[PDB]
Amino acid sequence: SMHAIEVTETGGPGVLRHVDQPQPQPGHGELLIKAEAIGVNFIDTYFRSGQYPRELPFVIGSEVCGTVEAVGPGVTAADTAISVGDRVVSASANGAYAEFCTAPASLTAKVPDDVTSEVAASALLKGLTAHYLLKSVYPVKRGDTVLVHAGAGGVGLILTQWATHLGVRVITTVSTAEKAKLSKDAGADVVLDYPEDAWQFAGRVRELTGGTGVQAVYDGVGATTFDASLASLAVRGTLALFGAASGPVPPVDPQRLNAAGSVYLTRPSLFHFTRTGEEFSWRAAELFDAINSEAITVAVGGRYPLADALRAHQDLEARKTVGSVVLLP
Amino acid sequence: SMHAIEVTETGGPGVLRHVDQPQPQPGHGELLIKAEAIGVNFIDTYFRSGQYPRELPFVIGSEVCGTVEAVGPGAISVGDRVVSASANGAYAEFCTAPASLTAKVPDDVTSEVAASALLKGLTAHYLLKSVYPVKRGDTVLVHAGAGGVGLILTQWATHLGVRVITTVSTAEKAKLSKDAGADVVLDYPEDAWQFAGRVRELTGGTGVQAVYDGVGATTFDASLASLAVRGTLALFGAASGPVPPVDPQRLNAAGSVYLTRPSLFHFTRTGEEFSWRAAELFDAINSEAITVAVGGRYPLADALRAHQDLEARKTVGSVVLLP
Numbered sequence: 001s002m003h004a005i006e007v008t009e010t011g012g013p014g015v016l017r018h019v020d021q022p023q024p025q026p027g028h029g030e031l032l033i034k035a036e037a038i039g040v041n042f043i044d045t046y047f048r049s050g051q052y053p054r055e056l057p058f059v060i061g062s063e064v065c066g067t068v069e070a071v072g073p074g075v076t077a078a079d080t081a082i083s084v085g086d087r088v089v090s091a092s093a094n095g096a097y098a099e100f101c102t103a104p105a106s107l108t109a110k111v112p113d114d115v116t117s118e119v120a121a122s123a124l125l126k127g128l129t130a131h132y133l134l135k136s137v138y139p140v141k142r143g144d145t146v147l148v149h150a151g152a153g154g155v156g157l158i159l160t161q162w163a164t165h166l167g168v169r170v171i172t173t174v175s176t177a178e179k180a181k182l183s184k185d186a187g188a189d190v191v192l193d194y195p196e197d198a199w200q201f202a203g204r205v206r207e208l209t210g211g212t213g214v215q216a217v218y219d220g221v222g223a224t225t226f227d228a229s230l231a232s233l234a235v236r237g238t239l240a241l242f243g244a245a246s247g248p249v250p251p252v253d254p255q256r257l258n259a260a261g262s263v264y265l266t267r268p269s270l271f272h273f274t275r276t277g278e279e280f281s282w283r284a285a286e287l288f289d290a291i292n293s294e295a296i297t298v299a300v301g302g303r304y305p306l307a308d309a310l311r312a313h314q315d316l317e318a319r320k321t322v323g324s325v326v327l328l329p
Numbered sequence: 330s331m332h333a334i335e336v337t338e339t340g341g342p343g344v345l346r347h348v349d350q351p352q353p354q355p356g357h358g359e360l361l362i363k364a365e366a367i368g369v370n371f372i373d374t375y376f377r378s379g380q381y382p383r384e385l386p387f388v389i390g391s392e393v394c395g396t397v398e399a400v401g402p403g404a405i406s407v408g409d410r411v412v413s414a415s416a417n418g419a420y421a422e423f424c425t426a427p428a429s430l431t432a433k434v435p436d437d438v439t440s441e442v443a444a445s446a447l448l449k450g451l452t453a454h455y456l457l458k459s460v461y462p463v464k465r466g467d468t469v470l471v472h473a474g475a476g477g478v479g480l481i482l483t484q485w486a487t488h489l490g491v492r493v494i495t496t497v498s499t500a501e502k503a504k505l506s507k508d509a510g511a512d513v514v515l516d517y518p519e520d521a522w523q524f525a526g527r528v529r530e531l532t533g534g535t536g537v538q539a540v541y542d543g544v545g546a547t548t549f550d551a552s553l554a555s556l557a558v559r560g561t562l563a564l565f566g567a568a569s570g571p572v573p574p575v576d577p578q579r580l581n582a583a584g585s586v587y588l589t590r591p592s593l594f595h596f597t598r599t600g601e602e603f604s605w606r607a608a609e610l611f612d613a614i615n616s617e618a619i620t621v622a623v624g625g626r627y628p629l630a631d632a633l634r635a636h637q638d639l640e641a642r643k644t645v646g647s648v649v650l651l652p
């Protein structure tokens with residue numbers, strides 16, 4: 001048997017039970033991965049809470065780095081260059097909080113030999129997200145200025161470094177002075193406190209951009225920042241609302257987008273930017289290229305035993321984590 | 330003195346009032362225009378109804394073609410025939426407009442066609458070239474295909490090598506929409522999912538690259554459901570009424586799509602920008618890439634009846650008021 005974190009009923013971090021499960025078997029198109037490091041993602045909390053509904057019970061999580069223990073039967077091995085023994089990482093696994101899990105080969109990348117498994121499980125899901133946000137949702141160009149909320153979070157630090165490397169000025173928000181320094185170290189040109197009032201905060205942003213506003217806002221915080229994000233945009237700018245850490249954004253009168261400057265609102269999901277193995281491989285390769293040139297550096301921001309998934313979810317929801325955190329099996 | 334159409338209280342078409350006013354003088358950078366044809370635009374109804382607030386009382390309308398009667402101090406001269414979509418108080422025998430947002434009318438474009446084409450044609454330009462830059466091979470959905478904006482969007486998109494699907498309310502309108510270049514003309518959505526199902530059948534399962542939706546309340550859900558992944562919903566109007574607040578997670582579920590609510594104001598920000606869009610519009614008219622028909626005429630005094638017809642979905646294409 002193996003250890004796993006199973007959810008039998010949805011609810012708070014408390015429902016994350018460390019239990020014995022049979023080792024899974026890979027199906028068609030799947031690899032069986034023996035975990036070395038397991039990624040923690042804010043979306044895990046939405047599945048745990050039952051926000052994002054899923055069939056019960058389930059072993060939680062989708063991000064894992066480890067070694068290929070087995071390749072699914074049938075045609076599978078003919079359709080991938082991944083082989084048993086390879087160190088691999090996926091953001092699309094089933095039941096990642098376990099010693100062993102499965103993932104589609106087409107949405108799994110080989111880890112470069114100079115990248116540790118902890119860094120890979122810190123980098124992939126959030127790094128693919130930063131990639132699509134910066135290259136596809138709003139393609140940043142040198143000279144732009146963007147706003148990135150939660151600048152010292154997992155996605156936040158990657159967005160900040162990568163945008164800075166691309167010649168983009170980045171303004172961030174964080175909750176503590178410790179996080180402010182990490183954000184500056186990541187390349188943020190200015191770090192602000194969280195908005196108290198949308199117009200007040202937008203004025204700060206306008207001050208910094210000469211009244212223009214930012215070309216794009218990357219908002220992964222949602223409820224507490226949305227109004228401020230919308231108010232901070234340059235004419236025809238893009239609000240990429242990609243997360244809801246503080247809670248869901250209430251229904252938006254489309255005429256607000258007019259008043260704000262004929263802006264665009266989009267709410268993307270990673271699913272729509274990893275639609276083929278070809279697309280996934282392209283983004284994963286650009287991510288590992290950026291890491292290996294030190295265009296970005298993905299630090300391991302926190303580590304927990306797999307059995308302490310509960311503790312990680314508590315710290316994450318309490319705004320106590322910095323950067324990417326991993327579970328260790 | 331001059332005749333004008335004024336609103337002293339907001340409401341339905343009934344609040345439109347005949348008034349005589351002194352002829353205006355143009356301020357700095359402005360032209361005084363003697364109207365030959367006055368444009369009618371759905372936005373006129375939003376100002377009349379109070380849906381778009383404005384300090385009362387005021388004279389309705391912003392689109393006019395006529396001759397320059399006077400210039401404010403500060404290549405347009407008195408005597409020149411011009412058209413603007415940014416005039417103040419256009420439902421009148423004379424009005425003012427900023428010279429920087431006024432175009433000279435090509436000599437072979439009638440004044441009615443100018444007042445049928447400019448506001449709506451600048452809108453079609455920004456929608457097709459700026460909000461979502463259509464590409465040859467794209468398919469787009471345009472609601473109200475036989476309306477003023479809809480006919481221009483359809484012809485221009487078709488010229489650009491884009492496939493257009495439209496909606497209209499009548500068989501007469503369906504014929505006009507096909508003649509404008511629409512590849513398929515559909516009935517308005519009854520069920521959003523079934524409508525989207527039909528659109529996906531027409532696009533090889535893909536959905537459309539963009540929806541240009543100027544109808545709003547009665548089409549929005551279907552527009553959203555018809556999009557290709559990462560497509561753009563350009564909600565630029567609200568003829569059927571305002572779109573209810575949109576849960577951003579619906580944009581996720583629809584395929585990580587973009588939603589945008591553009592205003593002509595943000596696409597005519599400089600004289601340079603205006604001139605670029607206007608020139609491309611008149612180039613298209615001059616080469617017959619598009620042809621703007623006058624779809625109806627009303628006396629200035631009958632602005633009430635024009636607004637009644639507009640809201641009752643009875644107009645076909647661009648309509649004008651004549652002094």
Ligand SMILES: NC(=O)C1=CN([C@@H]2O[C@H](COP(=O)(O)OP(=O)(O)OC[C@H]3O[C@@H](n4cnc5c(N)ncnc54)[C@H](OP(=O)(O)O)[C@@H]3O)[C@@H](O)[C@H]2O)C=CC1
Pocket residue numbers: 040041042043125126129149150151152153154155156173174175176179220221224242243244245246247268269270271316317318319320321322323324
């Ligand atoms: N759409 C997509 O494809 C994807 C979306 N996401 C989303 O992006 C966001 C970032 O993900 P991830 O890097 O894993 O998480 P983070 O590491 O960014 O952690 C969330 C951070 O948000 C900030 N925050 C502000 N208000 C709150 C609150 N009320 N509760 C908790 N946190 C708050 C906190 O930092 P601070 O101290 O600055 O407040 C916190 O550290 C998440 O919302 C996630 O759901 C992630 C991956 C893919």
Ligand SMILES: NC(=O)C1=CN([C@@H]2O[C@H](COP(=O)(O)OP(=O)(O)OC[C@H]3O[C@@H](n4cnc5c(N)ncnc54)[C@H](OP(=O)(O)O)[C@@H]3O)[C@@H](O)[C@H]2O)C=CC1
Pocket residue numbers: 369370371372448449452472473474475476477478479496497498499502543544547565566567568569570591592593594639640641642643644645646647
């Ligand atoms: N910059 C911008 O954002 C601009 C936006 N617009 C908007 O674009 C839209 C089209 O403008 P315009 O060409 O002047 O108007 P149209 O000539 O298109 O008239 C509106 C049409 O919409 C259709 N419609 C569908 N449902 C309704 C309803 N319940 N009530 C009334 N009409 C309905 C009707 O035709 P059918 O028989 O097909 O139903 C009607 O003819 C308007 O909503 C306008 O506000 C216009 C200019 C600039």
